[PDB]
Design a protein around this ligand. Structure first.
Ligand code: DTP
Ligand code: DTP
Ligand code: DTP
Lengths: 732, 152
């Protein structure tokens, strides 16, 4: 017996199954119909639902996804799309845009503002821009990512209500629904086509929200906690409210005084950081089943802090629960001085933030001033301190960083000397969960404190592999910077401090994807450093067009209220504060008129304080069958675990560039990678999420020497690198 | 504990009797002058001769700059993120004064409960409870000592 969608029973007509598969095979090479029809080991049994037939065939086709046969990527991707299209409308052919939006609003899935903002006529018109055939350009790995999260669906029953294309056009409509009716359509079609053809990438929260009653769209947050019972109580109640929205938290507690510090004079002594830190952890995991999953955050603190030794080991598996806060990630802030004490084989002094005045502030604002105060307090005997050999301390950090791989580094001096902000008015003293973002902050004395400031991320990324030449970045830069800045006025702000910053500086975090595929296409690699110049030219275009796009919006809608606090308003450009040592590895001259931009911005300002930051993109890149950000692919075919099964995705165009790519573990070292990352920092407003890779197989006795772990860390700083992400250690 | 002393050096500044009379003076310093001293002596003699007992926080506070005297607390948390955020920030402020906490979370919905209709499902009580624990132990060595509470 055969089960149909409507339930009407009927006999098995295998040819039907064959034809379906046949159709999806058209134009593909190295793909076998038999394999799937046998791989599936489909087990017929009297009365079987035809839908289970799809699940079975799709899965089978998936398991065949290999390097030797990459077309199984689209073959299966199309078989799925079919089931998805058929499981939502009752047939492949999608319903009219108008009818769709209508039916949805009735079910309370789409925001009713769509019917009010647009007319029936306009809808029918946008319906023409839609090209439902683009759903066949998706890779299997991308399809799965969409079906699980991207598409509007019933999490309980399992019903899916929309298709890929409808998602694109709608996200655009709501983002540009306020533009004048003169160009409102114009931007709608220009944006849709961009995202649908994978020219522009958007953050998961956006792709799965705009156009739905929901108003939570900010993936990550950066909170700064002061040295107060009140401050902490706030910083805690905050993370809670945010994590409930599944948004990552970057905590900065470095203000909290150290253990033993006198409280209220002499009526009590400080209890310690550990006690509070844990509280922050419970907050981050306040909304997870069993606390096991969800809730991710990275806490930061100075390297010269008094409790540095105790904080350095917090992520260690092996130790007393009383002195451990494993779940949270951390980021040790280091500066020029610390690195110098190591080279000269000298010691390091640990201080409590509340015992050395003007030390914290100078630590981010003025490196010189920091040195003055630092040295002074060292001789002061009355000041509580502790000496530690620079060689020992750093080793501890590198040790925990290796053991866990969640201990990140952040050079403060590089985040204030070569940044879009004025370290005196608004200095960067923290990062996000990604560790990519670099924005100023202000501690709150309460939840509704108006004078507080919270940094929020509204990211995006370009597809290096979707453009032909750098000039195509002009249009893209506009479609991106425009739609993004618009979201800032579309989403809500539960916390005042978060809103203040968003409206005050209107920052944006734009990155890139398919970078690996990019370098490969031009026949370049990471290690050798043959991509040094190309990288300089390519970014130089990505940043320029973005700075010219934000300036254009500033002339049409006014620059950000706090543009005055930015160095961009004082005539300072990224090409003026970049690490000087960067000229010893690149000679590629500027290809854009940065002088004509120095004026247009000097007179009309920028709608956004910061546009360009480099962040990791797992979900984004997948939907575009692209390579994660700038990071090189580990292997041709990557595997992951889903709720439906095993996922496989092959590097884009492996059929012609298999010998062009350079797998992660094919790299002799990290030299090249660092140089490229350093070159990027010269343009990126914010920071980059660079990982440190190591292969024990390339070391004597299979043990990574500490002489090499530091040797590389020093190189990173020497080239202006801002932050260091994960530290992968391959397992043969 | 009770006597005024220097916790650091170890110097003791007062004697038992002075503690008694002073605690009474500050407690009845607002009474009319005629009835003032009468109560001062009548209270002092009572406590000094062990006729009446007083809580530790009182015996070791009234008559000094400190103003924290409440030993124990009873907070009621509602079923919301806001409520919890408050109930947490509260226990913190109180435990810093070494005051015991009696929490009542029984309002917080149970695991699986639908949130915002169907846009999300409850995570559970355990996640929040722990948070309350970290709060209670927010001011303790290690986290082991101090900070006591009973949840209902
Ligand atoms: N009665 C059947 N005999 C043989 N194979 C069937 C039968 N019904 C379904 N299948 C198989 C063939 C396809 O692979 C898949 C069919 O699902 P699908 O074609 O999408 O919807 P459907 O079975 O209701 O008919 P339709 O082709 O009109 O959509 O399962
Ligand atoms: N009884 C306590 N036990 C342990 N830690 C405490 C205690 N009281 C306060 N703290 C911690 C929590 C915060 O980190 C910090 C409190 O700062 P804060 O509330 O501003 O103190 P304060 O109001 O008395 O003035 P000050 O900042 O000068 O000490 O010290
Ligand atoms: N994402 C979540 N996961 C698990 N529990 C949550 C989540 N979000 C909120 N909760 C819990 C904690 C709160 O006690 C409560 C909801 O708090 P709140 O923010 O006030 O929701 P709400 O008032 O908007 O809707 P509701 O009245 O249904 O709770 O449920």
């Amino acid at each position: 017996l055969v089960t149909k969608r409507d339930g009407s029973t009927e006999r098995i007509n295998l040819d039907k199954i064959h034809r379906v598969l046949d159709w999806a095979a058209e134009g593909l090479h190295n793909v076998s119909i038999s394999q799937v029809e046998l791989r599936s080991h489909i087990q017929f049994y009297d009365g079987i639902k035809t839908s289970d037939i799809h699940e079975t065939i799709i899965k089978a086709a998936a398991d065949l996804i290999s390097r030797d046969a990459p077309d199984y990527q689209y073959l299966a991707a199309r078989l799925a799309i079919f089931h998805l299209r058929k499981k939502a409308y009752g047939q492949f052919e999608p319903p009219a845009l108008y009818d769709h939006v209508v039916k949805m609003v009735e079910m309370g899935k789409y925001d009713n503002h769509l019917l009010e903002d647009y007319t029936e006529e306009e809808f029918k018109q946008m319906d023409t821009f839609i090209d439902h055939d683009r759903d066949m350009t998706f890779s299997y790995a991308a399809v799965k990512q969409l079906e699980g999260k991207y598409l509007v669906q019933n999490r309980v029953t399992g019903e899916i209500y929309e298709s890929a294309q409808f998602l694109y056009i709608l996200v655009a409509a709501c983002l540009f629904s306020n533009y004048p009716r003169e160009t409102r359509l114009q931007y709608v079609k220009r944006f849709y086509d961009a995202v649908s053809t994978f020219k522009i990438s958007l953050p998961t929260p956006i792709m799965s929200g705009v156009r739905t009653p929901t108003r939570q769209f900010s993936s990550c947050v950066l909170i700064e906690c002061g040295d107060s019972l009140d401050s902490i109580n706030a910083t805690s109640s905050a993370i809670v409210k945010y994590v409930s929205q599944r948004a990552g938290i970057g905590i900065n507690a470095g203000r909290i005084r150290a253990l033993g510090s006198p409280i209220r004079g002499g009526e009590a002594f400080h209890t310690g950081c550990i006690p509070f830190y844990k509280h922050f952890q419970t907050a981050v995991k306040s909304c997870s089943q069993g606390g096991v999953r969800g809730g991710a955050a990275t806490l930061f603190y100075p390297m010269w802090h008094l409790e540095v030794e105790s904080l350095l080991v917090l992520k260690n598996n092996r130790g007393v629960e009383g002195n451990r806060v494993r779940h949270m990630d951390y980021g040790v802030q280091i500066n020029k001085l610390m690195y110098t004490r190591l080279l000269k084989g000298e010691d390091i002094t640990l201080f409590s933030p509340s015992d050395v005045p003007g030390l914290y502030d100078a630590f981010f604002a003025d490196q010189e001033e920091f040195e003055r105060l630092y040295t002074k307090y060292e001789k002061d005997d009355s000041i509580r301190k502790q000496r530690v050999k620079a060689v020992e301390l750093f080793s501890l950090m590198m040790q925990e960083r290796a053991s866990t791989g969640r201990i990140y580094i952040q050079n403060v001096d590089h985040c204030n000397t070569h940044s879009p902000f004025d370290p005196a008015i608004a200095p960067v003293r923290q990062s996000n969960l990604c560790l990519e973002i670099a924005l100023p902050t202000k501690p709150l004395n309460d939840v509704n404190d108006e004078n507080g400031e919270i940094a929020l991320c509204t990211l995006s990324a370009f597809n290096l592999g979707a453009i032909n030449n750098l000039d195509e970045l002009e249009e893209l830069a506009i479609l991106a910077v425009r739609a993004l800045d618009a979201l800032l006025d579309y989403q809500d702000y539960p916390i005042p401090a978060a809103k203040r910053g968003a409206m005050g500086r209107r920052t944006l975090g734009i990155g890139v994807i398919n970078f690996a595929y990019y370098l490969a296409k031009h026949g370049k690699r990471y290690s050798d450093g043959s991509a040094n110049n190309l990288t300089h030219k390519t970014f130089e275009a990505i940043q320029y067009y973005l700075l010219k796009a934000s300036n254009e919006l500033a002339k049409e809608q006014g620059a950000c209220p706090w543009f005055n606090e930015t160095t961009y308003a004082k005539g300072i450009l990224p090409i003026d504060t970049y690490k000087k040592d960067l000229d010893t590895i690149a000679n590629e001259p500027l290809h854009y008129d940065w002088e004509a931009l120095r004026e247009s911005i000097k007179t009309h300002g920028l709608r956004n304080s910061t546009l360009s930051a480099l962040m990791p993109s797992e979900t984004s890149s997948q939907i575009s069958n692209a390579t994660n950000g700038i990071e090189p692919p580990r292997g041709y075919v990557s595997i992951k675990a889903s709720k439906d099964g095993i996922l496989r995705q092959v590097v884009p165009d492996y059929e012609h560039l298999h010998d062009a790519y350079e797998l992660l573990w094919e790299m002799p070292g990290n030299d090249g990678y660092l140089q490229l990352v350093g070159i990027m920092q010269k343009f990126i407003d914010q920071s980059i999420s660079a990982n440190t890779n190591y292969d024990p197989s390339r070391f004597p006795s299979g043990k990574v020497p500490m002489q090499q772990l530091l040797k590389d860390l020093l190189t990173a700083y020497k080239f202006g690198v801002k932050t260091l992400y994960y530290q992968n250690t391959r397992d043969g």
